[PDB]
């Protein structure tokens, strides 16, 4: 239902400008393997050292989850991390330079595939099938954030989803469908972004929602 989707033209121009940066510059995508947390501030966070992010001049990473339960699942275990980080409003240890990411965490041990798993993305624009594409992961269990981000990056490149000076795409959504039909599909609205900075934009990923990479495919619906 197109009238349940938010409109690009209702997004403040400054916000579209900041979203464009997030989905144009690959440097915002953190992709770290076999790390381990060694500190914690709030009970729903874990802190990792020696994660060097050149563009923000930070050395530590705080991952924020929506529960103490999630943090407890991952604190002090070998983990992979994938997602979009932020530096502004990020609080770390007092004498450290820290960036922040919501969720994006998978157990490392036993989750590494012997080769890239390919996930199909079908794209429709005003109901007409467009050129499809794939995204890839090396993880058996993969965060939705990783899949969503890889798709959104490609959509920004091909369709200028978030560009402040384009207006030919006004609405859109991304659906995650189980191949075997055993899980209820779900979607995100591309133009339904919370707040005005990264600390707010990506907070919804704090659920650390995770799927089987073998069992999902993606459909994107775009509308003029």
Q: For the domain bounded by 25-108, which CATH number is listed?
A: 2.40.50.110
**Separation CA 132–CA 110 (nearest Å):** 31
Domain 1-24+111-224 of CATH type 3.20.20.150: no
- The residue extents of the domains of the chain are 1-24+111-224, 25-108
Contact (Cβ atoms closer than 8 angstroms) between residue 71 and residue 51? no
Distance from C-alpha of 191 to C-alpha of 167, rounded to nearest angstrom? 13
Distance CA 196, CA 179 (A): 35
Structural element, H or E, at residue 72: helix 68-74
* Cα 9 from Cα 156, distance rounded (Å): 16
Contact present, 58 and 98 (Cβ < 8 Å): yes
Structure tokens at 174: 């991304």
Burial 165-201 (b: 16+ CB within 10 A, else e): eeeebbbbbbebbeeeeeeeeebbebbebeeeebbeb
Resolution reached, in Å? 1.8
Which strand (E) or helix (H) includes residue 107? strand 105-107
Beta carbons within 10 angstroms of residue 113's beta carbon: 14
181 Rama class: left (phi>0) / alpha (psi -120 to 50) / beta = left
Method used to obtain the model: X-ray
Q: Which of 79, 45, 83, 49 is nearest to 64 (CA)?
A: 45
Yes or no: say if 17 and 60 are a contact pair by the CB < 8 Å rule: no
Which candidate, 26, 79, 21, places its Cα nearest to that of 51? 79
- Helix, strand, coil content of the chain in percent (nearest 5): 25, 40, 35
């Amino acid at each position: 239902d197109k009238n349940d989707l938010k409109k690009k033209s209702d997004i403040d121009s400054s916000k579209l400008f900041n979203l464009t940066s997030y989905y144009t510059d690959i440097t915002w995508q953190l992709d770290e393997s076999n790390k381990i947390s060694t500190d914690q501030l709030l009970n729903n966070t874990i802190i990792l050292k020696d994660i060097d992010i050149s563009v923000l001049k930070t050395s530590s990473l705080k991952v924020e989850f929506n529960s103490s339960d999630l943090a407890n699942q991952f604190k002090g275990k070998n983990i992979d991390i994938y997602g979009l980080y932020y530096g502004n409003k990020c609080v770390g240890l007092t004498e450290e330079k820290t960036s922040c990411l919501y969720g994006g965490v998978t157990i490392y041990d036993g989750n590494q595939l012997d080769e890239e798993r390919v996930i199909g993305v079908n794209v429709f624009k005003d109901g007409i099938q467009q050129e499809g594409f794939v995204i890839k992961t090396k993880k058996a269990k993969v965060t939705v954030q990783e899949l969503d981000t890889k798709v959104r990056f490609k959509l920004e490149n091909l369709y200028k989803i978030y560009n402040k000076d384009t207006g030919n795409i006004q609405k859109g959504c991304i659906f995650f469908h189980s191949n075997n039909h055993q899980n209820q599909s779900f979607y995100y609205d591309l133009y339904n972004i919370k707040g005005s900075v990264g600390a707010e934009f990506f907070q919804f990923y704090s659920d650390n929602r995770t799927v089987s990479s073998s069992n999902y495919h993606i459909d994107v619906f775009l509308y003029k």
